[PDB]
Each structure stands twice: as C-alpha cells, then as structure tokens.
Write a protein that binds this ligand. Structure first.
Ligand code: FAD
Ligand code: FAD
Lengths: 448, 449
C-alpha cells in the first residue's frame, strides 16, 4: 500500500503529527504495536495523575481531615476498585483516539514496524511505502546491570501491581522516582527513596531540591542519598534486600527501578534505512526534526529531546505544518518549555535556574525575588507544608528568565505564567497585574 | 490634638495597604479601626470563606469521590468546634502579623470608631486628631430585605458566627457570595437551598458560567430556585423558618442566610461635616486618582462602589501612597481587566469582557469565540463526573484576547498567569505558541482550536 505519510508509533508525537497532516489532504497511516496513546496514556501521565489524586484523597482523610474536624475511619482501601476505575477511564480515552483518527481517515495498523529501506516498511507480513516517514517510537525503562536486578519492577510494572505492597523501595530519584515515591508514601506504604546523587532533582533550581528534602524528612518517603545499588537478594520469606555499594541495606516487599529510560530505536532496522543514531542510541535530528536521510524524520523521546508529551505533540504538529502546509521554517523552539512534577507538593518550573542565569549573565546582572509561606490548606493543621517561589530576573529592565515554585497549586498556576514568559514579560508586567486573593498564584505578582 | 501626616479610617484591605506604604516613605501615620485588624477580608470574608471551602473539599473527598477511588470510609464525627477553633487561631495569627508590620513602620493603631469633626479633624474615643491627608476606607456591610420576618435570617457575618451546622439551610441571593456559601454548606452535608431572584445564578458573568453552574447544582446540590422573590419569613412553633415567595412557593429550613447585597459604611461618620459627596446609593464619589471632592480627603475600596475585591483596594491604596508621598504624580490603578475567582463548586475564573459584552462593543463580525468543554480528571474516574468549560473571547483579525472565562477544578490557581498575559496584550497566537503542561486543566487554554 502506498501512503503520503506514515508515522511509526501511536504515542504522543505520532498521533499529533499524523492528525495534522491528514488535515492537509495527505493520505496517512499510523502504526502502533500495543495501545493507542503510547507511554503517556497507558503507563505514564494519565495513570500517574489518577494515582496522585488517590494519594491526595487519602491524605485529606488521614492527614489533614482530623484538624478540620473530621474523625474518620478508612474501613477498607479497595485497590481493585481504584484500578478498575482507572482502567475504564483509559479505555474511554482509547475509544476517543480511535474516533479522531477515524474521522481524519487515517489508516491505523496494529503491528510492530521495521524498515526495509529508506521508503519501505514491513508490518505483519505486509510491505507499505511512503514518501515521508516519521519515527516516533518513544523509549522504555532502563534497568541496572547488577545481581538480582530481575527481582525489581520498573514504572510499567508499578501500574500493573495487583495490590499495594507494605514496604516499597524506589531507586533513582529523577522526576519519575520522586513522583512515584510521593504517591506510594501517600497511599500508606512504608516507602524508601534511594537517590544516587547527594540531592533529589539535582538539575532543578536548588530551592526546589532543598524544599523537597524538607518535606520528605517530615512526611516521608524516607530519603537515602549517595545510594548506588550493588545487589538485590531475594530472601526465603519472599522479601527483597537491597544492598548498596556503600554498605547500607534495606528489606522491602517491592523494589521499583526508576533510574532512567532508553530509546526504543533498536529493533527496527534503522541500519537499512541508513538513519544515524548517537552514542546513547537516540536518533540524531536537526532543528526541523530531519534525520540524516531525506524523507525520514523523528520526534519525541526517541530523539534525546526533553521527555515530555507536549514537546512531542508540538514538534509533531509543526513538522506536519512544515511538510504539508508550506511553512518551510516551521519548527519547535525547545527553550522555555514549562515542566510540572507531580511530587508532594507539586513543582512548577520554566526557564533558567538561578545558577544558570548567574553563569550565563553574571551575578552582576541577576536579581532573584523569593517568597516562602505555608500553604493555606495546611496552615490550619499540625501538618503545615511550605510553598516556595522564585522569579529570576536579568538586567535593569528585570526581564524574567526563570519562574520556579514548589507547593500546593503549582500544577495549575504555571501555564499562564509560561505564556507571559514566552511574551518577554518583565517584573513590571507581573507587578502591574492585579492579584487574585486568596491563592498561592498571587504571590508571583506581589513579590518585592 | 495629635497631628499626623496621613490617617486612614478603617484597618481593612485598603487602609492597611495604603498606610504601610506611606509609612515606608517617612510619613507619620495613624490607622483607626473600630473592630478587628484585617477588615472584612481577614475576619468575615476571604480568609474564613476559603478555610470553609477547603473543609467542604475534604468532606467531598471523603464522602463523594473517595468511594470510587477505593476508600471505604466512615466519618465517625464531624466536630464543628475543632474546625472553627483551627480557623479562628489562623485569623488570630494573621492579626499578629499585621500588628507586627504596622509596629515596625511606626504606625499608631487607634482602636475605636472615628467621625469627622471638619475636613481635617477626626474624633475617636473623645480624642481629636488632625492630619494633612485623610483616607476613608470604611468598607461595606451586608444588606437585608425589607420584608416581614427579615430578622429571623442571618447574613454572611452571622454564617461565620454559627455555633453548629444547621440541618436545612436556605441561602437567598445567588450573586458570588451566595453561590460560594451555597456550595460550601451543601458540601459540608446540610440540605441546602439557593434562591435566586432572576433566571440564572451569577447573571452578570458570561452565560457559559451561569449555565454550567445550573447543571452542576442540579446534579449535586444546592437545590436552585430561580425567579424567587421573597415575600415573608414565618417562624414556626418548633422554631424552624418558612420562606414564602411571591409566586406561592415556600420552603421550611432551620437557617436562612440573606446574601442579597452589601451597602457602603459611609453613613455614621459625619461626612457632611467634611463636605465629602456621596452618590445616590451612598458611595463616596472619587476620581481616577481616588480624590474625593475635598482636597486632602481620599477614599478607596468597597465604600467607593468600585469592584468589591481585596486586591483592588490594596492596589489602589498602595498607588495612592506612591502618588502622594513618593512623587509619582500620575500613579493610579487601572480598573479594567481585573481578574476574579469565585470559590464556587466548581471554582470560576474570569477576566475581561464576557462574550455578550465583547459583541456589543465590537460587533458580531469582529468577535471570535473559542470554547472547550471536558470532564475534570479528578472526577472523571468516579460516578460524579463534573464539567469543566473554558472560553476565550477574541477580537479582530489579530485575535487579540479580550476575555478569558472558565469554570471547573483548577480555575482558582490557573487564572493569575493568564491575566498577566492579557494585560500584556496577548493574542491567540501567543497562547498557541506556548508549550502545554500535561496533564492539567490549564493547558486547555493554549490548545484551543
Ligand atoms: C511514569 C511516566 C510518567 C510520565 N508522566 C508525564 C507527565 O505527567 N507529563 C508529561 O508531559 N510527560 C510525562 N511522561 C513522558 C511522556 O509519557 C513521554 O514524553 C511521551 O509519551 C513521549 O511520546 P512519544 O511520541 O515520543 O512516545 P510514546 O508515547 O512512548 O509512544 C511510542 C509508541 O511507539 C510504539 N512503538 C514502538 N516501536 C514501534 C514499532 N516499531 N512499530 C509500531 N509501534 C511501535 C509504542 O508501542 C508506543 O505506543 C511520563 C513518562 C513516564 C514513563
Ligand atoms: C463573604 C465575603 C467573601 C469575600 N471573599 C473575597 C475573596 O475571596 N477575595 C476577594 O478579593 N475579596 C473578597 N471579599 C471582598 C473583600 O472582603 C472586600 O472587597 C475588601 O475587604 C474591601 O476592603 P476595604 O478596605 O474597602 O474594606 P474592609 O476590609 O471591609 O475594611 C473596612 C474597615 O473599616 C472599619 N471601619 C468602618 N468604619 C469605621 C470607623 N468609622 N472608624 C473605624 N473603623 C471603621 C471596619 O471595621 C472594617 O474593618 C469578600 C467579601 C465577603 C463579605
């Protein structure tokens, strides 16, 4: 069969690019080996956020509810009910995705695709060819090469758990490990988070790492830094003992590897098409998402770019604008991409951290405004939680180049502030907007 | 007589904001407050309302959403006294923070009720004090209907004084205060009725917001009764109350809260001795720079009839002290594109023109509206799914954004940043060019098509 455009991978980048191309009169096919929606819908963004909301309910019942006057007994936490509700939601999302590709007349092929040559793919015995092929294959969890690595699960296995284990160790502490440790701790398991560096989230602004250590020490999970796994022993009673290079050990019922992800570019015969990958296995692309082979493009996690769904969606849509709607310079600017981490409490960040701004512009040019306060939701309780915010400004005009915050509300407040930073907001622009009270967000327009 | 550079009558949102800013420039100041520091917002407004809204959110999490997430829970006891004690201790700590800052700024705080003796002299507690500049920031108070039985109803101040939660509650007025209270009391478990005089609640807001609110109340409570014109309140033998309406409907409840409006507190301070003019509704008339008709007397806040929000009184109060005492002769507050969040169930966020307003102003042919409707993810895995609806109102070829409106979970924290972008002259292209944050409610505004 011949197509104008084929996308390999029905995830975030693949679906977004193919739907936009289909709007410009291109005949398109989408190939997906597993479930529509990719990592984000099935084992990523969406089930993570449902589990985060379940942890927030249990914390409202058990931790904050008593000081608001609610004496409550959780008679039973039915794990199966929560998984059933979450799974039915993902099933309705699958049906909405099929409907959109359908109305767009996109051919969806369920199967694993491999290249035959630069223009030809084989999927399920059949060969298909196209003049434009997008590789959007995403990535997969990495696992350490250590004795006993197979007794641990990774984030995909977390979403398949049949019950909540009593004692859990999460190894990594990049944003996925921090998010899962916060959710599992919040749902009531005795939880340990092992971070290999001396601080969780080390590339984030230091205000964020320092505040996360504080709430973890007060509320769990139990943080262990400078922790490099050496081995995992399975014990006769069934439990697992994690052994660290430095000598520490911990016995738990479940161990989750959250050390990193690697690109799924390996079993699709890229060598035949001639596409170059780098040392880490990522497909090398230029600013326009072109590979080294004319007619083959890549977007998403398999390119080594920041691993976020909106980034794969915008790069995929802009690619179809460039190819099919005559916009030859259309492309995604990868700077100032906003990120929210659904930790406890959530983190929101966009732009340069204060060290970054200072290295790039010199201390002389950098003015930082900071706010620290207690989240109002928690202020009436014995479980007060900090909220800390930072604006990083440069020059006499105080152009805002970085906005960072950790606390309740950070997840929903950051989007409009990232529009404003994209428009080139200065501190004066923030200060001339009237505050909304009482919110955590108004702290960013009343900093002094 | 003691003489000050600047005196503020009213230690609420406007008064504290303006006096602290003047004190920072070396002005010797006095602040007069008859009751508690912080005014309506700290004591019977913004702050206690939001603590009660968090309490309703926790009860809904336990009772309404929790079961579908797998939590089988028994509320063994809801101790109203614990909640009120926690709420009150927090407001007390805020009282202390304000005294600390006022003390650091060397402001003399005078506790009592002030009245004008003439245009530059005030009397408080028998003492007479004078100043070159006097700010009147006296706020407002709950209005009450003139009908038989009005005295059996309480108002929003009385709601914050309740000794216990009543079993059946009627809130009359579905302006934003009645809508908030109706949703909080219903969320805490009481049988709640909300009576609206017109066809829909929040009649001044964009129709998309009024419509979604009706749909939510129909499904979840409070019970809405529109075209409800109060005739009388009858107290029954057993002590319950029956609200009688003009059209013949009636409703028996244990507690009835009037939330029909607020009027200015400008009437007992002998404004006529100073010569300050008020309008027909009793508000002090001010120009662009908050000047009254008497040189040296200014007014800010709810008593001027400007939009009744704490941030507006704070910003107008600070910019008035900048103008008077820091040589910014043109400093003043722009009253357009002020953002509002209503802490209803679900919350509402709006800034700029409603779609009707934009169409009258620019004409139909110039207006382009984008809308998004979806289910809040928090509720989407339960049997109590709740709508989220958002609207962008754009004008002209460039699609300059002139209104941003939404109702749904997340609206309370997401609006501030979009209001900054609106003030910056954002067009829909500026929203579209920003990468989304997933999964959030807020990303819907930068992905509308
Ligand atoms: C636990 C977790 C939480 C996350 N949470 C968030 C979050 O909250 N917000 C956020 O923005 N990002 C989040 N991410 C990141 C987000 O999931 C990814 O960045 C996004 O899914 C990447 O899109 P993609 O198109 O590159 O690949 P993917 O979405 O991974 O999709 C690739 C698709 O390709 C298919 N495939 C692979 N090879 C073939 C083949 N040869 N033939 C056919 N089909 C094939 C796969 O089956 C898969 O469906 C999270 C990731 C994880 C693991
Ligand atoms: C139930 C409710 C909820 C609200 N929720 C919000 C919200 O969440 N967000 C928001 O932005 N706004 C909210 N508001 C509105 C906000 O409370 C007001 O807009 C704001 O308080 C007005 O500030 P002000 O300075 O004009 O007056 P006020 O805060 O009312 O203060 C005026 C002060 O003057 C004192 N006073 C009066 N006369 C004299 C006298 N002659 N001598 C001495 N002292 C005197 C009064 O005791 C009072 O303390 C709410 C209002 C109510 C009633």
């Amino acid at each position: 069969k011949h197509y104008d455009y084929i996308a390999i991978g029905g995830g975030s980048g693949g679906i977004a690019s193919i739907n936009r191309a289909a709007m410009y009169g291109q005949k398109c096919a989408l190939i997906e080996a597993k479930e529509l929606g990719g990592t984000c819908v099935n084992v990523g963004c969406v089930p993570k956020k449902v589990m985060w909301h379940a942890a927030q309910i249990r914390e409202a019942i058990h931790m904050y509810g008593p000081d608001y006057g609610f004496d409550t007994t959780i008679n039973k936490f039915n794990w199966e009910t929560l998984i059933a509700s979450r799974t039915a939601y993902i099933d309705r999302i699958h049906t909405s995705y099929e409907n959109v590709l359908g109305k767009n007349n996109v051919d969806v092929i369920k199967g694993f695709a491999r290249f035959v040559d630069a223009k030809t793919l084989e999927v399920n015995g059949e060969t298909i060819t196209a003049d434009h092929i997008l590789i959007a294959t995403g990535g997969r969890p990495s696992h350490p090469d250590i004795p006993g690595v197979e007794y641990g699960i990774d984030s995909d296995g977390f979403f398949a758990l049949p019950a909540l284990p009593e004692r859990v160790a999460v190894v990594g502490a990049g944003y996925i490990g921090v998010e899962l440790g916060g959710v599992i701790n919040g749902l009531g398991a005795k939880t340990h988070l092992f971070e290999m560096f001396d601080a969780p989230l080390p590339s984030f602004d230091p205000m964020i790492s320092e505040t996360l250590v504080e709430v973890m020490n007060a509320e769990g999970p139990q943080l262990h830094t400078n922790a490099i796994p050496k081995a995992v022993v399975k014990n006769t009673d069934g439990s697992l003992t994690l052994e660290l290079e430095d000598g520490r050990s911990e016995t738990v019922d479940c161990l989750i590897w959250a050390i990193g992800r690697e690109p799924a570019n390996d079993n699709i015969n890229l060598e035949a098409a001639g596409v170059k990958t780098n040392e880490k296995g990522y497909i090398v692309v230029d600013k326009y998402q072109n590979t080294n082979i004319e007619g083959i493009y890549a977007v998403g996690d398999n390119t080594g770019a920041v691993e976020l769904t909106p980034v794969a969606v915008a790069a995929g849509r802009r690619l179809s604008e460039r190819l099919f709607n005559n916009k030859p310079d259309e492309h995604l600017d990868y700077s100032n991409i906003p990120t929210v981490v659904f930790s406890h409490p959530p983190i929101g960040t966009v732009g340069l951290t204060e060290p970054q701004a200072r290295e790039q512009y010199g201390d002389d040019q950098v003015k930082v405004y900071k706010s620290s306060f207690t989240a109002m939701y928690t202020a009436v309780t014995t479980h007060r939680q900090p909220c800390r915010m930072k604006l990083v400004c440069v020059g006499s005009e105080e152009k805002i180049v970085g906005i960072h915050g950790i606390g309740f509300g950070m997840d929903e407040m950051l989007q409009g502030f990232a529009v404003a930073l994209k428009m080139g907001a200065t501190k004066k622009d923030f200060d001339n907007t009237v505050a909304i009270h009482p919110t955590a967000a108004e702290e960013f327009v009343t900093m002094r």
